[PDB]
Scaffold this motif. Sequence first.
Motif, PDB file in Angstrom:
ATOM      1  N   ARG A 118       0.826  -1.202   0.000  1.00  0.00           N
ATOM      2  CA  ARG A 118       0.000   0.000   0.000  1.00  0.00           C
ATOM      3  C   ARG A 118       0.863   1.255   0.000  1.00  0.00           C
ATOM      4  NH1 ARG A 118      -4.709  -2.152   1.751  1.00  0.00           N
ATOM      5  NH2 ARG A 118      -6.597  -0.923   1.344  1.00  0.00           N
ATOM      6  N   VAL A 140      -2.633   3.270 -14.786  1.00  0.00           N
ATOM      7  CA  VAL A 140      -3.372   3.924 -15.856  1.00  0.00           C
ATOM      8  C   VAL A 140      -2.998   5.397 -15.853  1.00  0.00           C
ATOM      9  CG1 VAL A 140      -5.637   4.679 -16.592  1.00  0.00           C
ATOM     10  CG2 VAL A 140      -5.262   2.298 -15.977  1.00  0.00           C
ATOM     11  N   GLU A 141      -2.598   5.911 -17.017  1.00  0.00           N
ATOM     12  CA  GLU A 141      -2.102   7.281 -17.092  1.00  0.00           C
ATOM     13  C   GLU A 141      -3.229   8.292 -16.940  1.00  0.00           C
ATOM     14  OE1 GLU A 141       1.230   8.650 -17.859  1.00  0.00           O
ATOM     15  OE2 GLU A 141       1.863   7.604 -19.683  1.00  0.00           O
ATOM     16  N   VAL A 152      -3.024  10.431 -12.135  1.00  0.00           N
ATOM     17  CA  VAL A 152      -2.760   9.028 -12.415  1.00  0.00           C
ATOM     18  C   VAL A 152      -3.272   8.191 -11.253  1.00  0.00           C
ATOM     19  CG1 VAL A 152      -0.960   7.301 -12.523  1.00  0.00           C
ATOM     20  CG2 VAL A 152      -0.869   9.286 -14.004  1.00  0.00           C
ATOM     21  N   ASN A 153      -4.074   7.179 -11.562  1.00  0.00           N
ATOM     22  CA  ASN A 153      -4.552   6.216 -10.582  1.00  0.00           C
ATOM     23  C   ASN A 153      -3.817   4.896 -10.759  1.00  0.00           C
ATOM     24  OD1 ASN A 153      -5.741   5.379 -12.980  1.00  0.00           O
ATOM     25  ND2 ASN A 153      -7.729   6.252 -12.426  1.00  0.00           N
ATOM     26  N   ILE A 154      -4.213   3.904  -9.968  1.00  0.00           N
ATOM     27  CA  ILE A 154      -3.476   2.645  -9.913  1.00  0.00           C
ATOM     28  C   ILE A 154      -4.316   1.476 -10.411  1.00  0.00           C
ATOM     29  CG2 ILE A 154      -2.413   1.017  -8.326  1.00  0.00           C
ATOM     30  CD1 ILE A 154      -0.583   3.166  -8.854  1.00  0.00           C
ATOM     31  N   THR A 155      -5.614   1.490 -10.122  1.00  0.00           N
ATOM     32  CA  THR A 155      -6.547   0.474 -10.601  1.00  0.00           C
ATOM     33  C   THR A 155      -6.267  -0.884  -9.975  1.00  0.00           C
ATOM     34  OG1 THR A 155      -6.616   1.670 -12.698  1.00  0.00           O
ATOM     35  CG2 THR A 155      -7.664  -0.482 -12.616  1.00  0.00           C
ATOM     36  N   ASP A 156      -5.249  -1.589 -10.462  1.00  0.00           N
ATOM     37  CA  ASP A 156      -4.937  -2.938 -10.005  1.00  0.00           C
ATOM     38  C   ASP A 156      -3.582  -2.967  -9.318  1.00  0.00           C
ATOM     39  OD1 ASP A 156      -4.345  -5.768  -9.805  1.00  0.00           O
ATOM     40  OD2 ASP A 156      -5.970  -6.073 -11.244  1.00  0.00           O
ATOM     41  N   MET A 157      -3.504  -3.683  -8.199  1.00  0.00           N
ATOM     42  CA  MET A 157      -2.253  -3.845  -7.471  1.00  0.00           C
ATOM     43  C   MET A 157      -2.100  -5.291  -7.013  1.00  0.00           C
ATOM     44  SD  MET A 157       0.002  -1.628  -7.317  1.00  0.00           S
ATOM     45  CE  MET A 157       1.404  -0.853  -6.517  1.00  0.00           C
ATOM     46  N   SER A 158      -2.547  -6.235  -7.835  1.00  0.00           N
ATOM     47  CA  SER A 158      -2.719  -7.614  -7.403  1.00  0.00           C
ATOM     48  C   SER A 158      -1.448  -8.441  -7.546  1.00  0.00           C
ATOM     49  CB  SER A 158      -3.840  -8.292  -8.188  1.00  0.00           C
ATOM     50  OG  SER A 158      -4.460  -9.301  -7.414  1.00  0.00           O
ATOM     51  N   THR A 159      -1.513  -9.648  -6.987  1.00  0.00           N
ATOM     52  CA  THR A 159      -0.480 -10.668  -7.121  1.00  0.00           C
ATOM     53  C   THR A 159      -1.164 -12.020  -7.231  1.00  0.00           C
ATOM     54  OG1 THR A 159       0.987 -11.973  -5.714  1.00  0.00           O
ATOM     55  CG2 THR A 159      -0.257 -10.193  -4.684  1.00  0.00           C
ATOM     56  N   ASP A 160      -0.858 -12.761  -8.291  1.00  0.00           N
ATOM     57  CA  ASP A 160      -1.468 -14.064  -8.484  1.00  0.00           C
ATOM     58  C   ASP A 160      -0.831 -15.088  -7.545  1.00  0.00           C
ATOM     59  OD1 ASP A 160       1.018 -14.474  -9.694  1.00  0.00           O
ATOM     60  OD2 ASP A 160       0.206 -14.075 -11.693  1.00  0.00           O
ATOM     61  N   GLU A 161      -1.246 -16.347  -7.692  1.00  0.00           N
ATOM     62  CA  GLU A 161      -0.731 -17.406  -6.831  1.00  0.00           C
ATOM     63  C   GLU A 161       0.744 -17.683  -7.093  1.00  0.00           C
ATOM     64  OE1 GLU A 161      -3.514 -16.958  -4.780  1.00  0.00           O
ATOM     65  OE2 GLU A 161      -2.082 -18.461  -4.072  1.00  0.00           O
ATOM     66  N   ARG A 197       2.580   1.694  -3.356  1.00  0.00           N
ATOM     67  CA  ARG A 197       1.683   2.325  -4.309  1.00  0.00           C
ATOM     68  C   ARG A 197       1.504   3.808  -4.026  1.00  0.00           C
ATOM     69  NH1 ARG A 197      -3.645   3.693  -1.999  1.00  0.00           N
ATOM     70  NH2 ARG A 197      -4.081   1.465  -1.720  1.00  0.00           N
TER      71      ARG A 197
END
Lengths: 337, 659, 212, 227
Positions: free
Chosen positions: B193, B229-230, B211-220, B196
């Motif tokens: 967090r 995203v600009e 500018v925002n972030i939208t996704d901050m994920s991590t897969d398995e 970001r």
Amino acid sequence: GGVAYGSETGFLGTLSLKDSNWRGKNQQFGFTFEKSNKNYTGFALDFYDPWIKDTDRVSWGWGAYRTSYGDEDSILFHEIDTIGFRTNIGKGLGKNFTLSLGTKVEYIKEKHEDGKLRQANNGKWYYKEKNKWREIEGVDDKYWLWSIYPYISYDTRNNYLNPTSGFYGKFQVEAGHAGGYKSGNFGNATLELRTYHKGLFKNNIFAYKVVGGVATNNTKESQKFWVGGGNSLRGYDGGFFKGSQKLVATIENRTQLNDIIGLVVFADAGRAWKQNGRDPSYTRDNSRFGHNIGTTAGVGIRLNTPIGPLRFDFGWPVGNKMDDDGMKFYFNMGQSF
Amino acid sequence: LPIKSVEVVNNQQVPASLIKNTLKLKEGAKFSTEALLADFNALKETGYFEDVILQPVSYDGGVRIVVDVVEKENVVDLLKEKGVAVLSSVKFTGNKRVTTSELLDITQLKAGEYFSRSRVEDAQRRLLATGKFSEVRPDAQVANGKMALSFEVVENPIVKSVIITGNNTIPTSTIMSELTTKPGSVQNYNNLREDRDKILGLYQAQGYTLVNITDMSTDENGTLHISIVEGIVRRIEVKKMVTKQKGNRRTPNDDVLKTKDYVIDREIEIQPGKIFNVKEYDATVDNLMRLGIFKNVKYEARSIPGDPEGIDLILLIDEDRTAELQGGVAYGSETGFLGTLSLKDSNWRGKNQQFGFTFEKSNKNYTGFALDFYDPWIKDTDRVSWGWGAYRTSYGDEDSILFHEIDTIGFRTNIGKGLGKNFTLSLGTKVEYIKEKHEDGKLRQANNGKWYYKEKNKWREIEGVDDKYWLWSIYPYISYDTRNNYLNPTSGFYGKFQVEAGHAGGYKSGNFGNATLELRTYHKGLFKNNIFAYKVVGGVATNNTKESQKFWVGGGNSLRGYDGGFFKGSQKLVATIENRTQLNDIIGLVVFADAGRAWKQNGRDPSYTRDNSRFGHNIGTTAGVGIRLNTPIGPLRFDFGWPVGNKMDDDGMKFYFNM
Amino acid sequence: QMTQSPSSLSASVGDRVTITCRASQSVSSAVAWYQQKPGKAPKLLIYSASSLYSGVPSRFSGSRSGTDFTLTISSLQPEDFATYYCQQFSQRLVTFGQGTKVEIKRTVAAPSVFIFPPSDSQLKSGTASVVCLLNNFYPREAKVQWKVDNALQSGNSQESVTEQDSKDSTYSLSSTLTLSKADYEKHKVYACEVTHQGLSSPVTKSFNRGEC
Amino acid sequence: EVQLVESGGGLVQPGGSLRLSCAASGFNVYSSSIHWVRQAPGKGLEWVASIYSYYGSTYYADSVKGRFTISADTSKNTAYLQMNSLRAEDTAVYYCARGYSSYWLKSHQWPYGFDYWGQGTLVTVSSASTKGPSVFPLAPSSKSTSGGTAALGCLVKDYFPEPVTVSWNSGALTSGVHTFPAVLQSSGLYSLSSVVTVPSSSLGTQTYICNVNHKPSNTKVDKKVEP
């Protein structure tokens, strides 16, 4: 006279026709017209003879006034019309005591705020507070108003225009008959004290003014005492305090730096009490005469322009800050003291 | 709405006294989105609680601020007031951690309390702060009073790779270098967090504030799928800022802007296809403020459905005043119709064109007319100015024997082209009809037709009496402007330089010349709203110019403390320094000190008895205090100067009335 | 807080309809209502005072009138007759209105009601089921009364009313009984005194338990 | 292309448990809000819970203060709602709806309205489950064939909660059909009937055939009616 116009506000005209030597008999004769943005309209045809030609010190005079005062902050009293023709005659018991009896007749029309008061088919008026109807009476009130008052005044000021040292006490007892809603006879009294004495140094004059008055609850709401504005209590809007018991005290320190400007620092306090009015607009109705006395102070400019006297006032509401407003502006002539 | 009472609930041990001392939303205060926003920021920064849900409640026609606190557990050591201040097992040993040392030391057995798992929710929050876990499920196995409180946790796998998509402005290498949770370290929720937040801050620093972030994920598979995203301006719209317009609704006439669309369009610097460079927006707002007809401008970003990067930026604009009509009349014996009325319209026809009629009259036989028109930018042109102003001035000077009365009729015109936003080159011409009049009863003309003036019982021939003549002149002038705002400038430079040469008729018909240099600058002063202002005016003129057109020094315009036209001559230099203080929005305290003197008159009228040579000598000085109050009906000025230093004139106080 | 709205409203195609929604909150209160189609899912069509960008035929619009929020829908359309809700957003408290229904306005007619007595299958089980029906009485305004042993009934009836049909657009309210066998046998005359605005004066049905 | 689908719904007994899942199809839960609402049958909609990611705020509205939990992980781009100790009012559909603030900057997470709504899932808490339709062969003695008014019926009683159809000559005689929505038969089951209108010329000698389908319990009963 001074006129501002064009969008925003309206014809913000303040013109005068003061003639304080009219006909050469020392008689004061003047026509005053005022208009402001807050639906104010003022008329005044004031005539005053401090001494009738070849008489034993008997005053005389009459002044007819119309005031279409507006108060958008009151639901029941959105618009107020007034027509008045007052007359005062007085005899002096010396050069400092003045006893006078003065009568007047008033035609007043009260108006409520359109869109805020609803009248049902039964003819009665109801006001909606938290989704319920409350019966409110006296809406759209038109009534005559007759009253007389014998008053005594004590004067020792050296000069009326720019007094420097002396005492000035006025005391009137008013009792008259009014029509319209709750027809009856009402009473009123008023005591005003003004004094001056020398201050710190040259041209520094300390001035004290205390205004007091009580009124029976029978008086009409429009005729109840008002506290606020540049006349009585600086730092608050006109009619900030309402009630039947008013006491306002003001202390000013005027400095005459020259012949055309004047530096004045003022501090005033006062509050009206015991309103018990119908209009729920007044949410500051407080009992206990002598409590919650709002205080204000500030600096003022009283400049003597070559074209006439002029006043500028700026007060800071200090102490208990009931109202969050800061700076205040006031435009007027003459002097409050 | 006002505030009737601040009844705080759930603050069972965090001091009500401390919070009421800290909170500024006392009884009777004002309710405003900015006010509660600042208050929320203040209490969040104070650190007297971790989570707050402060919900303002309507009460008694006012506002009841109800603050729902969730206090932390690390402020009790202050000991100057403080916040919120038999079980045997915790069970469920973890895999990555032991969740026994870690819990029983940092969180459990001190904040865990062996039960009441609110600080245990906080415990899993601090585990996310260390990020070493993902999800913690407290399953309390309470058996016969005693409880096991099984804490089924999910552990963050270490990140194998970090992938940034759609940055398109900042190279990915720099983004990874800024990243704290590097590959090979355990995934960390709160560090993610803050990482970001730092990424957003870096984008803010580099000039992109949208500018925002939208996704901050991590897969398995431990792949930190970072997305950014600009935000590219697809369409910029302009509508007026609808603030708290008391007494007015959102009527079609209210929300529409009188100013035409092209005026705003030609001023906007933000362009579609660019990622909202905040410097461009700053330039746009600076230009709009410098336009003068606006008071505040704010931006607002609105999403366009179906387009992620799309932003429908919408500009908010505030209009101050377009039409004005101020006038003041004094009359009745003594002086005359002392009228000062104006018809200034500084947004006339909605094309930014300044249009105004000014009439003035005074006791000293002054009469003024001015029909001034000025277009700083012609509709759809390459920055070319235009305008014309016709003026009449029946100036009177009773102190001059030869020039007792002066009449003037003038129709000037100026057109200019700008070499940028700060350089302005313009050529302006004029035509004047002047009639000069002498003082009746002081000049005697003999039968021969010539005029004679009696000084110590002898007649002196004086020429040019009762002079009527046309006057044509042109002047190309260049001006340099950098002021932020024209109405109430605070910082900048303003230099004007005109060279005048024209032909005049009447007595001594010929061609005269003139030049004028005026410098105005401002810079910050002692403290807030204290602005130091410097103005120096210089000009020279050939002796061929008519006496009425010679330079005048005095009055409230040039040199305070002296009467109008105290100094006359063909060489004028006046310097003035002022210290203006903006104590509020309606008054202004100004202390001024000025000095200057005209030289080399060599005029015919013996009224001027102070004709002094030696340019740069006998420079009279003046100082005083001034009141520049912003009345609700219009600007107004008051000036009082004391003639100091060399006291050529014995007068003291001076008064001046102007806008 | 409760955000009550008038539940039942009737209109016609081409009419202008309004729906008030009471509220009690601060200045930062914003409302947003959905045209919940009666079959699938609600759909947003207003934000606080402005419509959703994509889905709106420029018909639905509204504003705030003090603490009451209303809608100014244009000439009605055949596909807009659905359930319309209301909501208001406080500091993390999503409140929903009771919801309103929009349908056509037309005239009345007269149904034909039967009484179906239970067969032997129910009679050996120990339960009583008596039903009477109302159809083509489209202006629903439903009101139904029953009476057993020619005197009265209380509470045992259950209600099941179908909404307006696709073509006839009328209503098909029916009410069914569930009583024990002893009471079914003991009573004498079976009836349901059904009357309402589209039913005019009450129509008396009868079944003397003598169903051979 | 953005849509949401709900899964994990099912049939439970009171005091039971479940886990409802809502999966995103084009937006990422790390920025959006995901709000859960429910609609009791024949009633209005009611908010349940909402989990604002990007802020870590997860509080449930009124009746979920301690019962259910809503947890959303961005790995599978889906939001999970837990169920336990369900009661009578919990029998409803469940919608997951994304909330959208008009501002593009996604640090403003205020809902401002729900636009993208899922399909919905039906969860029933009623007990006395897994029982046959036990339909009622309502065979009315006609004695009333006046024409276009003869009301026939096929009553269904104490039947297991599920969508069940009623046919009339396999839907051939559908003029004036009045098949009613199912209504809870008092204690624990639902009940419903149907009505059609037939002319007088056919009287009752015309063959009308009823058909019922209790599919979840794997029951299909074909019936008939004769005066």
